[PDB]
Specification:
CATH architecture: Orthogonal Bundle
Oligomer: monomer
Pfam families: Lys
EC number: 3.2.1.17
Number of domains: 1
Radius of gyration: 13 Å
Structural class: mainly alpha
Number of helices: 4
Function: Lysozymes have primarily a bacteriolytic function; those in tissues and body fluids are associated with the monocyte-macrophage system and enhance the activity of immunoagents. Active against E.coli and M.luteus.
Disulfide bonds: 6-119, 27-109, 61-75, 71-89
Helix content: 25-40%
Domain C-type lysozyme: 1-119
Length: 119
């Protein structure tokens, strides 16, 4: 599933993301997955990033059939249209690393942020 900019903002609010941090989250997501819940990316070290928030293989979700890693979730559960599991995990990564955990944010969202006044 691919969200429109405001569709994404709508879902994010629905999952309790801080309203004053919204422009950043939108910037992060648009730069990490283009608001696509099914995007996967394979990195050099052999790890994969899953879904909307491009959550990683090594540290946050398990590729197994059993939930695991720091988010205690199966990576496949982060490729669904429903983002509640991905959202809880993204909030857990943020709570620990702020926005620095995301490459896309780090070097694309330092300057100007998306206009979400229409949402």
């Amino acid at each position: 599933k691919t969200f429109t900019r405001c569709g994404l903002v709508h879902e994010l609010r629905k999952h309790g993301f801080e309203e004053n941090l919204m422009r950043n989250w939108v910037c992060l997501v648009e730069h990490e997955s283009s608001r696509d819940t099914s995007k996967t990316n394979t990195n050099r070290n052999g790890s994969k990033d899953y879904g909307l928030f491009q959550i990683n293989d090594r540290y946050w979700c398990s590729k197994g059939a059993s939930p695991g890693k720091d988010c205690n979730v199966k990576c496949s559960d982060l490729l669904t249209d429903d983002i509640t599991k991905a959202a809880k995990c993204a909030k857990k990564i943020y709570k620990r690393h702020r926005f620095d955990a995301w490459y896309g944010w780090k070097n694309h969202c330092q300057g100007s942020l998306p206009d979400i006044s229409s949402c």
